[PDB]
């Protein structure tokens, strides 16, 4: 009976962790794109100066 209850909590928790990870990767990739875009533009300002 404990093995059934553990299988239920396992799939329920892993369904949550998978969706959280899918969104955190989508966001961290977007935040990376912003940090690179910032570094490229501010580095050009200093090179021109």
Partner 1 sequence: QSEAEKARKELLELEALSMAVESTGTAKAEAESRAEAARIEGEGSVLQAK
Binding site for partner 1 (CB under 8 A): 1-2, 4-5, 8-9, 12
The Cβ-side half-sphere exposure at 1, using a 13 Å CA radius, reads 0
**Shorter beta-carbon distance to partner 1: residue 4 or 18:** 4
Shortest Å distance, C-beta 18 to partner 1: 19
Minimum CB distance to partner 1, residue 11 (Å): 10
In the complex, minimum distance from the CB of residue 4 to partner 1, in angstroms, rounded to a whole number: 5
User: DSSP for 8-40?
Assistant: HHHHHHHHHHHHHHHHHHHHHHHHHHHHHHHHH
């Amino acid at each position: 009976l404990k093995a059934q209850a553990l299988a239920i909590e396992t799939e329920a928790e892993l369904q949550r962790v998978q969706k959280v990870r899918e969104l955190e990767l989508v966001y961290a990739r977007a935040q990376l794109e912003l940090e690179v875009s910032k570094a490229q533009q501010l580095a050009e300002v200093e090179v021109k100066k």
